[PDB]
Design a protein around this ligand. Structure first.
Ligand code: CLA
Ligand code: CLA
Ligand code: CLA
Ligand code: CLA
Ligand SMILES: CC1=C(/C=C/C(C)=C/C=C/C(C)=C/C=C/C=C(C)/C=C/C=C(C)/C=C/C2=C(C)CCCC2(C)C)C(C)(C)CCC1
Ligand SMILES: CC1=C(/C=C/C(C)=C/C=C/C(C)=C/C=C/C=C(C)/C=C/C=C(C)/C=C/C2=C(C)CCCC2(C)C)C(C)(C)CCC1
Ligand SMILES: CCCCCCCCCCCCO[C@@H]1O[C@H](CO)[C@@H](O[C@H]2O[C@H](CO)[C@@H](O)[C@H](O)[C@H]2O)[C@H](O)[C@H]1O
Ligand SMILES: CCCCCCCS[C@@H]1O[C@H](CO)[C@@H](O)[C@H](O)[C@H]1O
Lengths: 122, 57
């Protein structure tokens, strides 16, 4: 049931993050005496919104939809880093390394192309 | 011969060539409409229907 590269190649699945079943509604205990890390962080964007540049300052600009033109090359993955337990019981993820950026170009209505470096660097 | 302002009278008793001439006129008008629309699309700015609608352009 475990897929190989030849199962995946060319399907688009390589740009998708893993999913969990609907039964996965559990709880993962944190031992405040234990150290933790995130072994893999994956971010799969599904929508890119761009804030319009309005001529009227009284007008509140909105984020509008866009068309992705650079294909299934957008996800961040294989990211790892320390997961610290803070004294107040909060957790802090500190990103260390990984494929943590993707150049992305989306296109607004009317043709204007918006390149960005989609990223969670540091 | 025919004076210049009468050249098209050769069609009066020629229904097929009258239809041909009417077809050519219709082709010219339809082509004007397509051309005009393409020129307007190449120049129209759609980013502000409030203060820059089509009738300002
Ligand atoms: C709907 C338009 C149209 C149609 C269907 C006809 C149809 C006809 N013409 Mg008429 N004619 C027209 C407009 C038209 N004409 C115009 C505008 C003029 C003044 C230039 C004439 C002057 C004219 C003469 C002197 C004669 C005819 C004749 C005839 C008959 C034979 C074809 C011919 O010799 O044309 C002639 C070919 C043209 C007139 C071509 C016109 C080209 C235009 C002016 C410019 C187009 C160039 C380019 C595409 C656009 C320029 C853009 C610019 C920014 C550069 C046929 C019934 C003949 C006939 O049967 O007489 C008994 C004939 O001797 N026509
Ligand atoms: C449906 C519209 C229509 C049609 C099918 C006709 C058809 C005709 N006209 Mg009539 N006419 C019309 C409207 C029309 N006319 C209008 C609105 C006026 C007042 C402007 C006239 C005044 C008129 C006169 C005084 C005469 C005719 C004559 C004729 C006959 C010969 C035409 C010719 O060879 O010109 C040849 C034309 C050229 C070689 C070049 C003309 C160039 C013009 C002046 C400028 C360019 C116009 C541009 C190319 C097109 C824009 C048109 C658009 C904006 C409407 C032919 C039966 C003649 C006739 O009866 O013969 C016996 C004649 O003497 N017409
Ligand atoms: C039921 C039969 C019938 C039909 C459907 C028509 C329809 C038409 N005729 Mg008329 N006509 C008829 C009988 C008919 N006629 C008879 C019995 C005579 C005596 C011979 C005439 C004499 C006559 C003359 C002298 C003229 C017309 C013209 C026209 C056209 C003017 C509108 C136009 O060009 O729009 C724009 C065109 C379109 C939006 C596209 C139409 C798509 C066509 C119809 C399909 C082409 C395939 C078809 C098999 C070709 C032959 C069709 C033919 C039956 C009309 C229109 C298509 C005028 C014309 O042709 O102007 C250019 C014209 O000058 N007719
Ligand atoms: C209701 C709509 C309508 C009607 C009734 C007509 C009628 C006519 N058109 Mg058509 N036309 C139309 C819409 C129309 N047009 C549209 C929307 C376009 C796209 C822009 C055209 C493009 C067009 C072209 C390219 C031509 C015609 C021509 C003609 C004439 C062919 C018959 C003829 O021999 O006249 C004889 C001519 C006359 C009777 C003189 C008409 C005078 C007009 C009304 C005003 C011209 C004023 C001034 C002198 C123009 C200077 C222009 C200059 C600065 C460039 C006839 C008057 C043809 C023509 O005129 O051939 C000689 C021709 O070549 N039309
Ligand atoms: C063949 C063919 C084809 C193509 C087609 C085309 C490409 C067409 C075009 C067309 C066009 C592109 C047309 C145009 C036209 C135009 C016109 C016709 C114009 C006119 C004008 C006028 C008439 C003006 C006048 C005036 C002046 C100048 C000044 C001011 C005043 C007045 C307004 C008077 C296809 C592929 C489809 C396929 C089938 C075959
Ligand atoms: C079958 C065949 C063929 C055919 C062909 C044909 C059919 C052609 C036609 C052609 C045509 C039919 C063309 C056309 C022309 C047109 C023109 C030349 C136009 C002009 C126009 C203008 C100039 C405009 C202007 C304007 C307006 C009007 C408005 C808006 C603005 C503007 C300025 C843009 C061939 C030989 C290839 C080969 C073999 C086979
Ligand atoms: C049917 C056969 C004939 C078809 C040929 C006619 C086509 C006419 C189509 C008109 C629509 C295209 O209109 C065209 O759009 C683009 C984008 O706004 C404009 O392009 C302009 O803005 C873009 C913004 O990215 C710049 O990169 C470009 O350098 C600049 O020229 C053109 O100035 C305009 O003319
Ligand atoms: C008959 C086919 C005509 C060719 C159509 C050209 C594409 S359509 C064209 O695209 C531009 C860029 O997105 C827009 O800015 C413009 O508003 C639109 O008209």
């Amino acid at each position: 049931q475990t897929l190989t590269y030849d199962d995946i190649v060319g399907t688009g699945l390589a740009n998708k993050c893993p999913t969990l079943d609907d039964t996965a509604r559990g709880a993962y205990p944190i031992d405040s005496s234990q150290t933790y890390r995130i072994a893999r962080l994956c971010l799969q964007p599904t929508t890119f919104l761009v804030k319009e540049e309005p001529k009227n300052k009284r007008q509140e600009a909105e984020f509008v939809p866009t068309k992705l033109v650079t294909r299934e090359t957008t996800s961040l993955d294989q990211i790892q880093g320390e997961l610290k337990v803070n004294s107040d019981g909060s957790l802090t993820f500190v990103e260390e390394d990984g494929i943590d950026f993707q150049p992305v170009t989306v296109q607004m209505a009317g043709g204007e192309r918006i390149p960005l470096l989609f990223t969670v660097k540091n | 011969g025919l004076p210049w302002y009468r050249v098209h009278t050769v069609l009066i008793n020629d229904p097929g060539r009258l239809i041909a001439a009417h077809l050519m006129h219709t082709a010219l008008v339809a082509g004007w409409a397509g051309s005009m629309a393409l020129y307007e699309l190449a120049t129209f700015d759609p980013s502000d229907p409030v203060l820059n609608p089509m009738w300002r352009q």
